[PDB]
Design a protein around this ligand. Sequence first.
Ligand SMILES: [Mg+2]
Length: 380
Amino acid sequence: SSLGWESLKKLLVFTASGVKPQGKVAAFALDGTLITTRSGKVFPTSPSDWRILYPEIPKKLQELAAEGYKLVIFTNQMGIGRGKLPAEVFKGKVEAVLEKLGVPFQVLVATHAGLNRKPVSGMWDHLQEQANEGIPISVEDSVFVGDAAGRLANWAPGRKKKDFSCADRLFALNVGLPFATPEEFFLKWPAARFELPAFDPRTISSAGPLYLPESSSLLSPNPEVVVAVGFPGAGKSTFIQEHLVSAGYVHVNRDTLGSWQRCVSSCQAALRQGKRVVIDNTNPDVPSRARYIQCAKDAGVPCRCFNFCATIEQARHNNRFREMTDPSHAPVSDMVMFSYRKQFEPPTLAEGFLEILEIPFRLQHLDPALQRLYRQFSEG
Ligand SMILES: [Mg+2]
């Protein structure tokens, strides 16, 4: 008599018989939190390779349900979106686990990257907005329990390995939920040491100057070559389009001209016509930039560098954000980010730049909802 499974593009939801909406929730991850492998291997050998993680678990769940907590699972299962784990098989595994736990659960399953993948709070919002009969949930009175908690190596005998991820802890931080690991919650073990990511998108801002030094000017009245430098996926092209190309700068993209000679001819022709040029590429190294500086030198026009300050993790954050929110965004691969960092050398005046502007990494004028999303951790 369970309502059963609902299937959405990037979400599965199961609602067991006996689930009731409530004003407070006790939520759990699945793998490594309520279950682990029966085989004793790190990864399951089959769909049936599971056992309840600790014998203490069903007693705690019975107590929570009697106290009026709605019991919920929030589980990341990317293998489904990637075609490695059949949805219909995973659904059966979940039902079997729930039968063994012996209490009514509502389960939410993030099958893909993006809005629903912890730590992004998409599943919470779905629970609250669509799957709780309109009853507001007190986050302060709720709890999330998971093993992707960013713990350091050796927090217990047999754990010479740090947690694979901090996604569970960060999900709870994004929602504002009190958080505990499975051992802290079910076994009353002392709290384990953990680390958060170095980049905290909650401290991102829209304030401050667009570029430094403020006494400089984005535009020049005369021909010149501007060389943009910075990680891909962190908003360079958008900036360049908004502030330079819109002002008549000729956009040069070496990647699409093919050869170097065609790129310089293009630059030279623009300058000969009295135009200004911007090179909108990553340009991470001295040799990469030297070609454009030499071109400018040969033409007798100034070369300036716009140096975008975005760090690798800011850029990767921005890229994930745009993947989730902008249907036209071209995803930047981790390979390309990695490659850029490996090749990067900071620009200096000795290369031959007239001046270097720094472009700080700042929040876009995004919709209120998108600004809330921008401030969420999106990778564990
Ligand atoms: Mg887990």
